[PDB]
Amino acid sequence: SQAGISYNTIVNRAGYAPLPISITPTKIKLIPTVNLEYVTCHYKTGMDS
Amino acid sequence: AYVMKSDDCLADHAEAYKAHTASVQAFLNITVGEHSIVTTVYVNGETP
Amino acid sequence: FNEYKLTRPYMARCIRCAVGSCHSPIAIEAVKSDGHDGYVRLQTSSQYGLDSSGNLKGRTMRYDMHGTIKEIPLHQVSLYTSRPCHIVDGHGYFLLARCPAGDSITMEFKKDSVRHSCSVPYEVKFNPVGRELYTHPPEHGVEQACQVYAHDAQNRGAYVEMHLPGSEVDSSLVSLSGSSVTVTPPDGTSALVECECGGTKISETINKTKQFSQCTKKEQCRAYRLQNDKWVYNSDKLPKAAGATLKGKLHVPFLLADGKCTVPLAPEPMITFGFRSVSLKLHPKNPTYLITRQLADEPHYTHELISEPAVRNFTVTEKGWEFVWGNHPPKRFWAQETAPGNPHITHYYHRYPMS
Amino acid sequence: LFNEYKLTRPYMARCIRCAVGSCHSPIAIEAVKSDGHDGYVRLQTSSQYGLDSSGNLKGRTMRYDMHGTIKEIPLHQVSLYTSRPCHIVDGHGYFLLARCPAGDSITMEFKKDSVRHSCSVPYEVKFNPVGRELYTHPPEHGVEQACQVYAHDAQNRGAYVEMHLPGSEVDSSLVSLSGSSVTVTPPDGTSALVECECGGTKISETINKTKQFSQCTKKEQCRAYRLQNDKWVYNSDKLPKAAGATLKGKLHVPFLLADGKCTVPLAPEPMITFGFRSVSLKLHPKNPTYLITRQLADEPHYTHELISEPAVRNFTVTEKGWEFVWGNHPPKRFWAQETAPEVITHYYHRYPMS
Amino acid sequence: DIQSRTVSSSDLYANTNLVLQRPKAGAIHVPYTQAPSGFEQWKKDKAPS
């Protein structure tokens, strides 16, 4: 799991030739599943008259 | 006296989150016999 | 757009009025400096954008002076915290200024040989944008996301409430003529004068000038002028009526919205190398955060505030390193082996130590 | 008489904070300097000081360009501040001397009967006091020390700022739809360059004419330029340059950092107390004052301590020496002669290790 | 940061880590980010002579 490091490897059957395979991961994500509980922001004191 | 939420809370609010069960997701540039392709793939077991 | 043309200003208590405390017409009730680049949202007893009759004038201010909505421009109003501010715009009860930082916001203007003033204690706080803790923003730099009190005065969602006003006491409506009391309501604005001492009086002097016997002094009967036509805000500095005061809803302008703000960028650091080591000579202009980590399980987050020329000899490994100096991007470094020796001893004790 | 800035003009330029936002101000501050001592500052402006709108000499007026035209303000109406207000001393050429205090910015401002032209800049103003006593405002009295301050003298002293040919200023008040097409209405007497495409990259060089550039239909596709060329400008980064060799003349920078005898405060006299090979000092400071002590032997063992509160300090004083410098006073210098108090205590004090 | 062989000279050596930067959209200005002056810094950081 590393970006930029162009992995390379070869499939090697017997009667057929080697097939190269070149794999470069550009962006590896990790997306959690998220559940919202609450939002909190500044307060305002409401003084009725 | 009471307490109410600020007028700027549409745009200055902190969201609280419970996180779990991440789904790693990888963008790959894959060349197989001069047949290059570019693909988002999931690293679940069976998501080909 | 300004649909609250039916909301009138009030006189409200202020601690300072250039001579002690008073009942200023430019009183302050809220000062919001939760935004970034010095801008501030104030909430006055005065209104902005209307004239004394209620028509849509421009950059003027309107205020009650004991009964009467007067009218000044805004180039005669001056508000300052520690240094002078710069009033950006106004709308209704709410004024958008571009203030510097201080403990106390003052707001004063001039009449014929009378400075009106209100100076209230509220921390007005310059909140910089980014890792470059500055005080006054620069001619140049890099753009970053910022929350600012924007010039947009539309109904961007938030509302405040306008109530029915409170019976305003006025000792000018009454006089002694000659030995018995006499009240004068101004222009058909009625009065609710209540009297005391043996014959407690109700009153509705609708359009007249009613004399009262059973009284000899002026402090014995208090006159209460009833407007009940123009609505007002839920001020802690005004009394309320009895039945049900909530009549309508205002919209607050100059809400904290998003955009971009030009933040500075630090001078380019000087980077000397060494075996498993990075030496950094740092020469800032304004105070700057240094945020550094490694790139393994033990990242060793180091977080420093530099306000003076610094030299930092950091340890660096083959597992990575990351360096953030101001609003620059992250510059990643990795290490490789030039240990002092030739295996072909002083080698193999630096490289692969503990042996 | 020395004003050969006459062959210059006042220019407009940008600054961040103009009382309404970012603008194109006439009173921009290109440079600020506070490398002197007693708070005097030198400011490099986008406005001249000491001339009229017609180039004839005049004492305490500033000229400035509003949207193409030069104006005048008397200098008694042009304010500026850093943290608390400044006090303009003098002005000459682009440059303006002031007597400002320490702060994080400079805001300079004026009015013309309905407007409020301000310009604020985050250039640091330093108050670099003279001597070993640290004042933020000078005293009514003290002593005199050599200093360097920004002079009131507007002479030519071998220091020269540059002067160039102003690039073509742009204007859109000239392009006007009269009618059903475009027509540049140039200013009376002065030419204008016009570089409007609208189909095919049309360009003309109107000497003095109100020409009807057709095939345009919009004034956003047309954009016009102005050619003054009669007077010259400073090499401002907030103004574009011309094409050719535009480098002529040297303007003398006035109000330089020159020498003088300024007035440093004088600390109170310390209450000295003597003792065997020892000097105690009880010190009473007004402002922060540097204590500077050494010994007159091979190992001076130097101390540099900024005393700001009432302190007491018990030094040592050998037979070789001890020095004492306290604020802006003269150096004192002390030596110790042998008065050691059965009889082994005398020899255990006098010549110890015995 | 500045070195001139003498005072009335014409040859100056300047290494101030000078790096230009882009102008903001809708502005004519030549910005930069340079090393601060080491002369003022020497003055702010000196021992007595």
Q: What separation, in Å, do the N-terminal and C-terminal C-alpha atoms of chain B show? A: 60
Provide the greatest CA pair distance for chain C. Answer: 122
Cβ separation C134–D114 shorter than 8 A: no
The whole-angstrom distance between E31's CA and the closest CA on chain C is 6
For residue A28, the chain B residue with the least C-alpha distance is B26
- Choose among E27, E40, E47: nearest Cβ to D14: E27
- Choose among C32, C147, C160: nearest Cβ to B11: C147
**Contacts with D23 (C-beta within 8 Å, 6 or more apart), sequence order:** D14, D15
Cβ separation C258–B11 shorter than 8 A: yes
Q: What is the count of residue pairs from B and C with beta carbons less than 8 Å apart?
A: 23
Which experimental technique did the depositors report for determining this structure?
cryo-EM
Whole-number Å distance between alpha carbons of D335 and C151: 73
Contact by Cβ (8 Å): C88, D18: no
Whole-number Å distance between alpha carbons of D152 and C6: 59
D325: alpha, beta or left, given left = phi > 0 and alpha = psi -120 to 50?
Answer: beta
Whole-number Å distance between alpha carbons of D73 and C278: 57
Contact by Cβ (8 Å): C201, C193: yes
Contact by Cβ (8 Å): C328, C265: yes
Asked if omega into D179 is within 30° of 0 (cis), the reply is yes
Backbone CA torsion sign across D333, D289, C307, E17: negative
The whole-angstrom distance between D158's CA and the closest CA on chain E is 10
The whole-angstrom distance between A31's CA and the closest CA on chain B is 5
**Coil/strand/helix, residue D77:** helix
Whole-number Å distance between alpha carbons of C38 and C125: 7
Which are the residues after which chain D is interrupted (C to N > 2.5 Å)? 341
In terms of DSSP bridges, do strands C174-176 and C232-233 run parallel, antiparallel, or are they unpaired? unpaired
C-alpha separations of C161 from C8, D90, D148 in Å: 13, 55, 62
Whole-number Å distance between alpha carbons of A8 and D200: 55
Burial track D66-95 (b if 16+ CB lie within 10 A, e otherwise): eeeebbebebeebebbbbeebebebbbbbb
> Which of B24, B34, B36, B38 has the most A C-beta neighbours within 10 Å, making it the best mutation to test the interface with A?
B24
In terms of DSSP bridges, do strands B14-31 and B2-5 run parallel, antiparallel, or are they unpaired? unpaired
Which are the residues after which chain B is interrupted (C to N > 2.5 Å)? none
**Nearest 5°: phi and psi at E44?**
-75, -20
> Which of D24, D79, D107, D123 has the most C C-beta neighbours within 10 Å, making it the best mutation to test the interface with C?
D107
Cβ separation C135–D121 shorter than 8 A: no
Helix, strand and coil in chain C, % to nearest 5: 0, 45, 55
Whole-number Å distance between alpha carbons of D252 and D5: 9
Looking up tokens 């005669």, which residue turns up?
Answer: C76
Asked if omega into C49 is within 30° of 0 (cis), the reply is no
**Contacts with D83 (C-beta within 8 Å, 6 or more apart), sequence order:** C82, C83, D101, D102, D103, D104
Whole-number Å distance between alpha carbons of C188 and D204: 72
Burial track B10-41 (b if 16+ CB lie within 10 A, e otherwise): eebeeeeeeeeeeeebbebebbeeeeeeeeee
- Choose among E29, E47, E48: nearest Cβ to D14: E29
CB atoms under 10 Å from CB of D212, counted, come to 12
**Coil/strand/helix, residue E40:** helix
Cβ separation C34–B6 shorter than 8 A: yes
Structure tokens at E31: 């910005």
C-alpha separations of D200 from C148, D211, D218 in Å: 44, 18, 14
**Coil/strand/helix, residue D346:** helix
Which one-letter amino acid corresponds to residue D298?
D
